[PDB]
């Protein structure tokens, strides 16, 4: 089997991407944030505290003839941006782009933090990291990909995120028309439950490539590119007027600037992030100070190849017995 679904930016800045997901019988379609940095599929639901729902579409298990309460199971998750959610668990039928899993754990939110409430466009998350990170207790549950894997034509999914445009998540096949050149594959460590890999270095603009190992995660659920402070300082030093602002919470730059590209290494291959991808717009409405898309990972504890990086590539998440990651230009 295979699946193919379009993923769409939630706003003009590509702050996140939503993908429609069918849950239950008859289908209830929710727009979920596919997140390769976490491993829970959770949804706004009929059980979510009413004051914490503001425009989202909810899953109502009682209206699904295939929903079954997973007795005794609870979940609770906190994300890197400080947001959180928790609740109980059902199993139900879940389909993405024509690919159907029966008996998928659908985590129903009883509580969500303010950032989720305030984002009306995201109805939940669909985790695509390794199932060892799944938070369901006392019986850990498998991700959608893990459940689908054996049925897929090939045990892979691909992320093809757009810049200010829709893109695609595919399951079970590699669309050879979706990228240019070749796919370069690189080793993955699953030791922390992530799609963790080591970039071979970077360049800023038309500058020389610096060969240096950068361990980090491929994370579709993170907006920006978070890299070591040395790398980030080297980038922003090429933008007149750019500075790190403690009050804003990162590097900002004059909105009048033309940003240089940023290149990262995948083995001997190179992925180029155009300068425009690094512009996240005014820090507040009307400001001439703009927020940067490359930020320091210092104090996160991990480097994160988020959407800013991933959207410059066609990315293969290879879930073979020894997982690997593949990157191609497009």
UniProtKB/Swiss-Prot annotation:
GO terms for molecular function: aspartic-type endopeptidase activity. Its EC number is 3.4.23.22. It catalyses: Hydrolysis of proteins with specificity similar to that of pepsin A, prefers hydrophobic residues at P1 and P1', but does not cleave 14-Ala-|-Leu-15 in the B chain of insulin or Z-Glu-Tyr. Clots milk. Keywords: Aspartyl protease, Disulfide bond, Hydrolase, Protease, Signal, Zymogen. Residues 17-328 form the Peptidase A1 domain. The keyword ATP-binding does not apply. GO terms for biological process: proteolysis. It is an enzyme of class 3 (hydrolase). Disulfide bonds join 255-290. Belongs to the peptidase A1 family. This is Endothiapepsin. The lineage of its organism: Eukaryota, Fungi, Dikarya, Ascomycota, Pezizomycotina. The chain holds residues 90 to 419 of 419 of the full protein.
């Amino acid at each position: 089997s295979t699946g193919s679904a379009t993923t769409t930016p939630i706003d003009s800045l590509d702050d996140a991407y939503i993908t429609p997901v069918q849950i239950g019988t008859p289908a209830q379609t929710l727009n979920l944030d596919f997140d390769t940095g976490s491993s829970d599929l959770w949804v706004f639901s009929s059980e979510t505290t009413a004051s914490e729902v503001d425009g989202q579409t909810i899953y109502t298990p009682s209206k699904s003839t295939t929903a079954k309460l997973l007795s005794g199971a609870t979940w609770s998750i906190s994300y890197g941006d400080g947001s959180s959610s928790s609740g109980d668990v059902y199993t139900d039928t879940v389909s993405v782009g024509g690919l159907t899993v029966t008996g998928q754990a659908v985590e129903s939110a009883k509580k969500v933090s303010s950032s989720f409430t305030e984002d009306s466009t995201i109805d939940g998350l669909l985790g695509l990291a390794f199932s060892t990170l799944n938070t369901v207790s006392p019986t850990q549950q498998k991700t959608f990909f893990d459940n689908a894997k054996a049925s897929l034509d090939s045990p892979v999914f691909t992320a093809d995120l757009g810049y200010h445009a829709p893109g695609t998540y595919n399951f079970g096949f590699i669309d050879t028309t979706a990228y240019t050149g070749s796919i370069t594959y690189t080793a993955v460590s699953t030791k922390q439950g992530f799609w963790e890999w080591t970039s071979t270095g970077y360049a800023v603009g038309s500058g020389t490539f610096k060969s240096t190992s950068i361990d980090g995660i491929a994370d579709t659920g993170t907006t920006l590119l978070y890299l070591p402070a040395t790398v980030v300082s080297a980038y922003w030093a090429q933008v007149s007027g750019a500075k790190s602002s403690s009050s804003v919470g990162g590097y900002v730059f004059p909105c009048s600037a033309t940003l240089p590209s940023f290149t990262f290494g995948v083995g001997s291959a190179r992925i180029v992030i155009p300068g425009d991808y690094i512009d996240f717009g005014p820090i507040s409405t009307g400001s001439s100070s703009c927020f940067g898309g490359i930020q320091s990972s210092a104090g996160i504890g991990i480097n994160i190849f988020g959407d800013v990086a991933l959207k410059a590539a066609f990315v293969v998440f290879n879930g073979a017995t020894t997982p690997t990651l593949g990157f191609a230009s497009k």
